[PDB]
Amino acid sequence: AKQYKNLVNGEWKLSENEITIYAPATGEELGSVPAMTQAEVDAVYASAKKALSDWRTLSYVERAAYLHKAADILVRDAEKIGAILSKEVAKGHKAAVSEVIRTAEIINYAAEEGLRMEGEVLEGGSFEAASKKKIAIVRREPVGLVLAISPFNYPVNLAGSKIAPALIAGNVVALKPPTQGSISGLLLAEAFAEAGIPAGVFNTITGRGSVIGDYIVEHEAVNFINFTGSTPIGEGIGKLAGMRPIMLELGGKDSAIVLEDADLALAAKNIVAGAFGYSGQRSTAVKRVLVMDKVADQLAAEIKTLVEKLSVGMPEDDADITPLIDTSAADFVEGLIKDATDKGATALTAFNREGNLISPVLFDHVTTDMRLAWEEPFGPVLPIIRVTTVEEAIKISNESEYGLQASIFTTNFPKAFGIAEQLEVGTVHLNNKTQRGTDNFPFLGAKKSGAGVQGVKYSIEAMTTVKSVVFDIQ
Amino acid sequence: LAKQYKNLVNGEWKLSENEITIYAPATGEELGSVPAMTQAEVDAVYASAKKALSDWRTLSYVERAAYLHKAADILVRDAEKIGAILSKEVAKGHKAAVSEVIRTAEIINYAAEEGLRMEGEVLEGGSFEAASKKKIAIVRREPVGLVLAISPFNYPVNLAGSKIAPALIAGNVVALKPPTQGSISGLLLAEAFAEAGIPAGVFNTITGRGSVIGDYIVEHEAVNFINFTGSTPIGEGIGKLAGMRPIMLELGGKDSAIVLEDADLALAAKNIVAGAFGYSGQRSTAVKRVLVMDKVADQLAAEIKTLVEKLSVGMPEDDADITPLIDTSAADFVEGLIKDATDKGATALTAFNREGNLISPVLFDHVTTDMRLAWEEPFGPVLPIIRVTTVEEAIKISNESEYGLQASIFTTNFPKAFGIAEQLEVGTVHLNNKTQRGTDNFPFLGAKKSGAGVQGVKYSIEAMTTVKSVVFDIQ
Amino acid sequence: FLAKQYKNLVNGEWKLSENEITIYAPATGEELGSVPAMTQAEVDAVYASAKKALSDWRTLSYVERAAYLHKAADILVRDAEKIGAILSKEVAKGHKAAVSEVIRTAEIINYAAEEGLRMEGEVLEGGSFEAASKKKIAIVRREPVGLVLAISPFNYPVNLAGSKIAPALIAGNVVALKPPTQGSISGLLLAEAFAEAGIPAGVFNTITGRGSVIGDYIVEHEAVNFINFTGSTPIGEGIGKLAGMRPIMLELGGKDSAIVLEDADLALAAKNIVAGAFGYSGQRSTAVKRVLVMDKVADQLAAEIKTLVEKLSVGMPEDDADITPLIDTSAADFVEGLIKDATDKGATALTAFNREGNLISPVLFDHVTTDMRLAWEEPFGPVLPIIRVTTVEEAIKISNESEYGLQASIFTTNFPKAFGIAEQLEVGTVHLNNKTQRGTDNFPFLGAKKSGAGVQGVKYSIEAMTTVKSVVFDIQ
Amino acid sequence: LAKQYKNLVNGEWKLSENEITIYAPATGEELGSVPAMTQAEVDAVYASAKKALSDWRTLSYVERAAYLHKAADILVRDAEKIGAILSKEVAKGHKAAVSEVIRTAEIINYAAEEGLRMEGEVLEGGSFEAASKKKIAIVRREPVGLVLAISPFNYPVNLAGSKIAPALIAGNVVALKPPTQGSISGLLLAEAFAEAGIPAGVFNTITGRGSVIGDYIVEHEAVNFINFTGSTPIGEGIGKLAGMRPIMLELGGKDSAIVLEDADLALAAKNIVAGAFGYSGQRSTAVKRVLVMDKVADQLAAEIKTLVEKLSVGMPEDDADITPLIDTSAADFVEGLIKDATDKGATALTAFNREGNLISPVLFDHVTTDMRLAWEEPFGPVLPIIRVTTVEEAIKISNESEYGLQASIFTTNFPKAFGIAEQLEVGTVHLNNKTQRGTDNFPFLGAKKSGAGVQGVKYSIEAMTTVKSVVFDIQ
Ligand SMILES: NC(=O)c1ccc[n+]([C@@H]2O[C@H](COP(=O)([O-])OP(=O)(O)OC[C@H]3O[C@@H](n4cnc5c(N)ncnc54)[C@H](OP(=O)(O)O)[C@@H]3O)[C@@H](O)[C@H]2O)c1
Ligand SMILES: NC(=O)c1ccc[n+]([C@@H]2O[C@H](COP(=O)([O-])OP(=O)(O)OC[C@H]3O[C@@H](n4cnc5c(N)ncnc54)[C@H](OP(=O)(O)O)[C@@H]3O)[C@@H](O)[C@H]2O)c1
C-alpha cells in the first residue's frame, strides 16, 4: 500500500484529507488518494490556464513527442500498473495489463493523428463571382481546458482516450478519475509527468464525485467536458454545461439480432464473449439477444453450453467472471435476476452469489414486461428475447432508451445493411459482437447513450474549433 | 393587402383560435396577422414531422435536392413580391429586402448541391491493429431527425433558409419558428416550399410569440436538434433546455475593427462605415467598435465622420441607408447607450436625433472602457472609437468582450496580422475588410457568448447529421 | 434526309478545311454529311487560340465557368432528339439509346459543374513536420493543368466527350476535342451546344481529320498539357508512346469477367449478363465478356442465358433493335473469326451464328476453353463465352490472366466472401450481383493493366485535370 | 577502406561478375565498387518484387509502418557512417551529408504515419440518380504494384527515401536504381531496410551501366510506376519509355527571386545567397536568378556581394560552402556560362577561379537575357542579377523560362505578392524566403519542364496508390 498524490502544476501534492481504496475482490487495502478541496481544484485549473499559452504555441511535433514518450513509459510499466489496476477494479490480471497496453496504443495513435489535421482554403468564387479574389484560410485551434472524467471499468484506457486527443491539439487537461480507480488514474499521470509534460499542461483531481463533481464541472475555467460514466450523472453534466461543448459516453443495452439464416454456433460464440467480458461491466457489450423463433431453441442451447464453461473466480486467476465492483452493483444485478425468475423467465444457467461474485446467468423466454429486457445490469446476466419477425426485432431494439451499438447475425449482408440503417445506434457489427474498437473507428451512441463522436480522429475534432482568416488577393 | 396568414402543418394551411397582429415598424401600417399556436397545435406539427421522416430520409439525395431547387426558383420568381412585404415588416430598405430573398435562394441552391455529394468514409482496422486487418468500417451520414429552426427578426428569410435547406438535404424534417416580427416573411418563405411540393410534414411552421411558446417548442421530446439565431440571453436558455441534444446557437456580437498605424485610412473608413451602419447597425456581424492606434486616430475618425454624414436617413421604401429600428424598446436601448457615452465624456462627431424610432447615425470618439457602449451590443446606428497605444492593448480590449463572433484588422503587414488573428478570440478575422458572414460557403462561428457550432453551408450540413458505422470482416 | 457540311469550332468561329471526310451510316450506307480534314497548320491554329484564351478563362470565378456548363447541358436536353437522331445513324446505335446518351451527357455536364465549383484548397502546417518551422504555413490552391486534349470514342461520341470536357472546363482548363472520324458529326453537334451556351472563343475548340495527317501531331504538340483518351488498347498504347512527360488518362479495352458461384441467383445473373454483354451489340469496353461459372450451376445458367439471348431483337438502329450492325466490316470480320476459332475448337454454339452485311446475330458459346481466342480477345461484337471452372481460385486465376482489368461482376449470396474475391481481382471495379457498368457517374471508373490509366468518374476526373499552386509564408 | 558493395535482391546480397568503381569527385579517392548488373539480373530483381507483392499488399498498414519506423531508426543510428560516404561520393559537405541522412529518416517516419491512416470512401448512387439510391460504392485504396524509384546524384539518400517510404506504406513493392555516382549511398540505405527486416523482395536495388541496362530497367513490363528525380534531358528520356505507366518526374529549375522596391533587402540577400549557393548550386530548387527592381538593385547587389565573398571554397570534409562539382563536364559547362556572361558584358562582382572542378562562387550584375546564364540551369555556383523596371516585366521574364519549379517574392505587400504568385508559372511561391522543398509535408511540384506529378509526403502516397471499388445494392 501507499499514499498517492495528485499532479498539480508539475508537482505532486497531498491533501489534508484522503480516501482509502480497497480491492473489491479481497478487501485488500491498496492505498489512499487525496480528497481535494475547492481551493485545491481552483489551483489546478489556474495552473492549467496559465500553462495553456506556452502549450498551444508549441509545434504539433513537439506536443506529439511528449505523448509518444508517455506511451513508451506506459508500455515499460504495463505489468506494474496492470497489477494494481487489476486489484483496484477486480479485473483479470492479464486483462488489466492489456488495458494499459491499449492505452499506450491510443496515445501514440492520437499523437500522430493530431499532428496532421486538415486545414482548409475556401474560394469566395465558389459562391459569388464578385468575391473570386477572396479566400478563407481555416485552421484548427484548441478549445482550452478540457475536463476529462474516466469511469471505473476502464480507468486507464478511457482516461488516455480523452487526455491524448486533447493534448495533441493544444488543449490543457485536468483528469478526474473515479474514486474506485483513482490509484490507476494517478499511475497513468505518473507516466505523463515522467515524460516531461510541462507544468500545468496535465493535472489530476481526486475526491468524491458526490462532493466535488458538480464543482469541478461548473467551474468556468473548464472549456470542455469529456465524460464517460452512468447515464444519470451524464444527464446532469449536460445541464451544467450550458453552451460549453461536451462529450458523454453513457450506458448501453446493445441488442444482438439473430436471424433464421445465422450461423448459430458462431453467433453464440460472439454473444457470450461480448456479453460476459469483465462480468458484463461494459457499456458496449451484448446485453439482449433478439432471436427469430424458428432458431431460438437451437441458439439458446449453444449459448448455454458456452456460459456453463466460463470460469468464475478471482482477478489474480484471470477468471472470465470476476467479482463485481461493489456490493450495491451485485445487489442491483441480483435484483434484476430475481425479477426475471419471478415473471417466469427460464434460467438456463444457475444463479449463485458468494460475496459479490455472481455466477453468470442466462435467461430464455424473457419478455418486454421484465426489467432485464431494458435496464443495463452491469453484471453477468443475459436475456434471450424471442421475436417472430425482423420488423419486431427492429422495433424492440429501437424501443430502448439506449442506442450504443448492435450486432446482426445473418448470411444476407445486403439485408443486414438495410436493417442497420433502421437501428437507432452508433455502430452495427455484422456477424460479430459489439465493441468500441478498433480505436480509429467512430464510437458514438444515440439517445441516452450519450453525445458526441469519439474514436481517435473524431475525439480530436471534437476538442478543437476553427479559426478562419479571410483576405482579398490583389 | 393586410392578410390573415396561416401555418404550414402536415401539408395543410391552418389557422389558430388566437392570432397576433403585425405592424410595419417604419409606418405603423397593419400588414396582417399570424396564428398564436397552442401547445396541442405544436404537438401536431411535431407528430406530423416525425411521421414524415421515414419516407423523407429514404428518398435519394437528388430527389431531396430537386425540391430545394424548385423552392429556390419560386423565391427568385417572387423576390419582388416577398421583398416588398419583408421591407415593411422589419423596416429594411426595399432593395435590401429583395436582395435578402435572392441571397436566400442562392443559399438554398448551394445547400442542395453541397448536401447531395456529401460522402462517407471507409476505415481500415489494420490502420490500428494487425489482427483487425480484414475488418472495415463503412461510415455513412444520416439525419439527426427533427430539426427545430428558430430565425431572427433582422434576416427572417435568409437565416430561415440557411437552416432549412442544409437540414432538409441531409434528410431531416424541419419545423421553423420565425420571429414574431418577421413571421409574415417566414410564412411567405414557407409558401415557396409548399408550392415546390415538399412532402407533407417534411417542412412545417410554428408561430406564437417566443415569450409565450418558445420554451415548450424547445423542450419537446420530439425535437432532436435545435438551430437558433437570436439574442444571447435566449440562446443561453435554449442551451439549458436542450439537455444532451445537439444545438447550434448564433448569438450576439461586438466585432472589433483594429486599425494599426500602417493602415490605409480611406479604405478602412469605407469598410468600417459600411459594416457598422448597414441596416442601421442591426446585424450580429457589424463593426461595433473601432480599436485604433492613437497616431492615426484623428485622421481615421475624420474620414469616418465624412462618410457617416453622407448616409441617407429615411424610410425603407426610399432605400435609405439608415432606417427606423425594429421597435420602440430597441431605439430606447440605443438612446440609453448614447446617453451613457455622452455623460462619461465621449465626443459626438455626429449629432444624435430621433424621430419616432428613426435614430440618426451617431459616431463617438474618445470612448473608454467604463462606457457601456464599449461592450454592450446596441443593435442600432451608433459606433464607438476607442483609442489604444499598442497592438497588445487592442488585442486585450478585443478579447475582454464576452462576444467573439468576428474581427477586422486594417494594416499593410499581413504576416503580423495573421499573428494577431491567431490571438483574437473570434471565429473569423477579416484582413482589410469589414466583418461579414459571407461568402456563405465559408465557415461562420462565434466564440464565447457569440454561440456554439459552425455554420456556413457545408458546416451546417455536417452539424445536422450524425454517422452510422457498419463494421464487418472480409473473408 | 439532308446531309450537311459540318465545320470545326476554332476560336469562336466555324471553319471548313480545304479537304473533308464524308461520313456514312454503318447500318445503311446513307451519306450523313462531311467533316473537315484538318491540316497540321490548322491544328496549330486551334492550339494557339486555346492557349491565348487560357489566361482570361482560368481567372474567372468557378460560378462563371459553371454557368456556361449548365447552359450547355440545358441546350443538349433541348436538342436531345435532334442530336440523338444523327448520332444513331452515325454509329448504328439504337435511336432511343442514342437520345439517352445525349441526356446522360447533360447529366454528367451538370454534375461536373457543381462538383468542381466547390472544390477546395488546403493549408498545411510546418510544425506538423519540424518544430523550427511551426510559424510557416503553406496555402495550397487548385489550378488547371492548361490545355486538355480530349479524344472521344465511336461508341459514346457525345457522352465520353462530355465526360472529359466538363470536368476540364470547370477547373479552368481550355479544351480541344478530337472526336473519332466515325462519330465526328456527333462531336461537332455537341460543340454547337457549347458555342450556343456562349463558351468564350478558344476556351473550347474541335479538331477533325485523318489519322494519317494529324493523328500523332495532335498528341505530340507542345501546346498540349494533358491527354484524356477513350478508345482501343493499341491506340492508347500509341498515345503513351507520344505522351512524353505530360499527364494522360486512358480508358481502353476490357474483357470483364462475370464470376457466377454455386450460391448465385441464377435468373438474376443471366439477366444481368445478357444485358451487359449484348448492349450496343457488345461494342463496349465495360461489358460482361466472359462468364466464369462453377461447374455445378453451369448447365442451369447456360440455359437461362440462352433463353434471353434468343429474345434479343436483331436489326436496324431506327427500329431500336437490341443487336444492330457493327461499326464497320473489319469489326465484323474480326468477330466472325473469333466465332470460327471457338467452333473449330469444339465450343457449343447455344445460339446460331448468322451474318448479313455487318449485322451479326448474337452468339452464345458454352464449353469455351482457354486455348480459344474468344476466352481472351475483346471482340467488340455480340458473342459471349461461358467458361466452366471448378473453383473460385480458378476463376480468379483465369480472370487475372487477362491483359485487361476493367471491371468484374460476382454473382453470389455470400458478400463477405465476395469482398475477399474482389480484393484479389485485378480490376478497377467489382459489381456484386449486377452487370459491370460505368455508372453511377459519381463513382470511380478506372481500368487496371491494359485497360487504361488514371481514375475517372466526375470528381476523380476533375482531380486528375487539376494541379496545385502553393504559397508559403511565415506568420509573425 | 574501399569496399565491394552488393545489391539487395530478394532478401539476399548479390555481387555481379562486373562492377563499377566509384571515386570521390573532390579528391579522386577510391570509395569502393557497386555491381554492374546484367539484364538477366534485372529480371531477377523484378521477378522477386512481383512475387513478394501479394503477401506485402495484404499485410496490415501497421505492420508495414513498423518496418519503415525500424529502418528510419537504423538510419539515425548510422547517420555518420552513411553520411561520411555520401559526402565523398557526391562531394557534398560532410555535415550536409549527415543531415541528409537524418532528414531521410524524418521523411520515412512521416510517410509511415501519413500512409497508415489513409482512408477509403463510400459514395451514394442517389447522389447522381434516384433509381440508384440503394447502390453504394465501397472505394478502398490499393497499391499500383512495382514502383521503380530512380534517385538523383545530389540527394542520393533523401530522394531515394522520399520515393521508397511512400511507396511501401501503401503496399507497393520497390526497386531502387541509384545513379552510378550515388550508388554506394543508395546501397547503404538499402542495408538499413534489410536490417529492419523488410520482407524478401519487397525492396530491392539495381546498379549498373546505362549502356547495359539503362533503357531495359524502365521499359520492363514488370514496372507499374516510375518515380524519377534528375536532369530535365534524362527525365525526358524516361518519359519516352513510360508508355502507359504513370510517372512522376522531378527535373531542373531556374527559380526566380523577385525583389520589389519595398523589400527588406538584407533579408532578401541572406535568403538569396543561402538558396543560390547551397551545395555549390547543384540543386533543382534554388534561387538561380534575381529579378530586382532597378531602384533597389545597387543596394541589393552590394548586400549579396558581401555575403558571397564570405562563402568558403574547398573540400567536402571541411564543410566548405562551395565544394567541387560532380564531374569535369559539369564544371566545363558552368565555366562556359560564366564566360558567355563575361563576354556579353555582365559585371563580375565576385571573381571566377577554377582549380580542378572547384569553381569559386561568381555573382554577376547587369545580366541581360541574351546571356545563356539568364536561362540555362548551371548546376554550379554562379548567380545572375537581372534588373527590371516593372513587376510585369519581372513576371514575364520569370515565366519565359522553360522551367517552373519555385519562385521567391521579397516584398512587404502580401496581397500583391499573392496576386503575383497567381501569375507565376511555378509549383510553389515562397514569400520573403528562399525557395526550398520543405517542409516535406508540403506539396513539391514543378510546372513545364521542371517535372510532372506532386510530391511531398501525402501527395507522393496519393500518386502511388489507386482505388478498387466494390459496388452493391442495399436490400
Ligand atoms: N459508453 C462508454 O464508452 C462507457 C464506458 C464505460 C462506462 N460507461 C458507463 O458508465 C457506467 C459505469 O461507470 P461508473 O459506475 O464509473 O459511472 P458513474 O458512477 O457515473 O461515475 C463515472 C465518473 O463520474 C464521476 N462522477 C460522479 N458523480 C459526478 C458528478 N456529480 N459530477 C461529475 N462527475 C461525477 C465518478 O467519480 P466517483 O467515482 O468519485 O463517483 C466517476 O469518475 C455505466 O452506465 C456504463 O455503461 C460507458
Ligand atoms: N450570430 C448570428 O448569425 C446572428 C444573426 C442575426 C441576429 N443575431 C442576433 O439576434 C439578435 C436580434 O434578433 P432578435 O431580436 O430576433 O432576437 P431574439 O429576441 O432572441 O429572437 C430570436 C428568435 O427567438 C425567438 N424566441 C424568443 N423567445 C424565445 C424563447 N424563449 N424560446 C425560443 N425562441 C424564442 C424569437 O421569436 P419572437 O420574435 O416571437 O420573440 C425569434 O424568432 C441580436 O442579438 C443579434 O446579434 C445573430
Short mmCIF file of C-alpha atoms in Angstrom, two decimals, chain B residues 58-63 116-124 126-131 133-134 136 138-141 412-415 432 474, chain D residues 58-63 116-124 126-131 133 136-141 412-415 432 474:
data_model
loop_
_atom_site.label_atom_id
_atom_site.label_comp_id
_atom_site.label_asym_id
_atom_site.label_seq_id
_atom_site.Cartn_x
_atom_site.Cartn_y
_atom_site.Cartn_z
CA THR B 58 -35.42 7.20 -47.71
CA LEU B 59 -35.64 9.43 -50.78
CA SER B 60 -32.47 9.85 -52.81
CA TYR B 61 -30.30 12.90 -52.27
CA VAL B 62 -31.05 14.05 -55.81
CA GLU B 63 -34.82 13.92 -55.18
CA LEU B 116 -26.19 15.65 -52.24
CA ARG B 117 -22.47 14.90 -52.69
CA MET B 118 -21.65 14.52 -49.00
CA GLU B 119 -19.89 11.16 -48.83
CA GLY B 120 -18.87 8.62 -46.23
CA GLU B 121 -15.65 7.05 -45.06
CA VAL B 122 -14.25 3.52 -45.21
CA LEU B 123 -11.84 2.95 -42.34
CA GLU B 124 -9.33 0.09 -42.16
CA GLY B 126 -5.40 -2.57 -40.00
CA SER B 127 -4.60 1.12 -39.56
CA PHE B 128 -4.74 0.43 -35.83
CA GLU B 129 -4.34 -3.32 -35.17
CA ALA B 130 -2.77 -6.00 -37.33
CA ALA B 131 -5.21 -8.64 -36.09
CA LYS B 133 -6.73 -6.02 -40.90
CA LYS B 134 -9.77 -7.67 -42.52
CA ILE B 136 -13.51 -2.38 -42.18
CA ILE B 138 -18.39 1.72 -43.61
CA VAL B 139 -19.34 5.12 -42.16
CA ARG B 140 -22.27 6.95 -43.76
CA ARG B 141 -24.05 10.12 -42.71
CA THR B 412 -0.37 46.63 -44.53
CA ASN B 413 1.66 43.95 -42.65
CA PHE B 414 -0.19 40.71 -43.28
CA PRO B 415 2.25 38.34 -41.53
CA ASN B 432 -8.51 44.97 -44.61
CA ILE B 474 -13.85 -9.54 -45.17
CA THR D 58 -2.15 -7.88 -47.75
CA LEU D 59 -0.16 -7.09 -44.62
CA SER D 60 -1.79 -4.54 -42.34
CA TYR D 61 -0.83 -0.89 -42.58
CA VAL D 62 0.54 -1.06 -39.03
CA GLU D 63 2.85 -3.96 -39.89
CA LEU D 116 -1.16 4.07 -42.26
CA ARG D 117 -4.23 6.24 -41.51
CA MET D 118 -5.29 6.77 -45.12
CA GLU D 119 -8.95 6.03 -45.71
CA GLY D 120 -11.35 4.87 -48.38
CA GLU D 121 -14.73 6.35 -49.13
CA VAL D 122 -18.33 5.28 -49.61
CA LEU D 123 -20.25 7.00 -52.41
CA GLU D 124 -24.02 7.15 -52.84
CA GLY D 126 -28.52 8.51 -55.07
CA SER D 127 -26.21 11.50 -55.30
CA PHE D 128 -26.47 11.08 -59.08
CA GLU D 129 -29.77 9.36 -59.88
CA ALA D 130 -32.86 8.47 -57.86
CA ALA D 131 -33.07 5.00 -59.38
CA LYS D 133 -30.37 5.31 -54.33
CA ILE D 136 -23.31 2.30 -52.83
CA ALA D 137 -19.65 2.09 -53.85
CA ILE D 138 -17.13 0.99 -51.23
CA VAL D 139 -13.90 2.55 -52.55
CA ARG D 140 -10.69 1.35 -50.94
CA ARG D 141 -7.07 2.23 -51.61
CA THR D 412 6.10 43.81 -47.63
CA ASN D 413 2.81 43.86 -49.63
CA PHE D 414 1.38 40.37 -49.25
CA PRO D 415 -1.95 40.79 -51.11
CA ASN D 432 10.21 36.62 -48.07
CA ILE D 474 -28.68 -2.44 -50.16
#
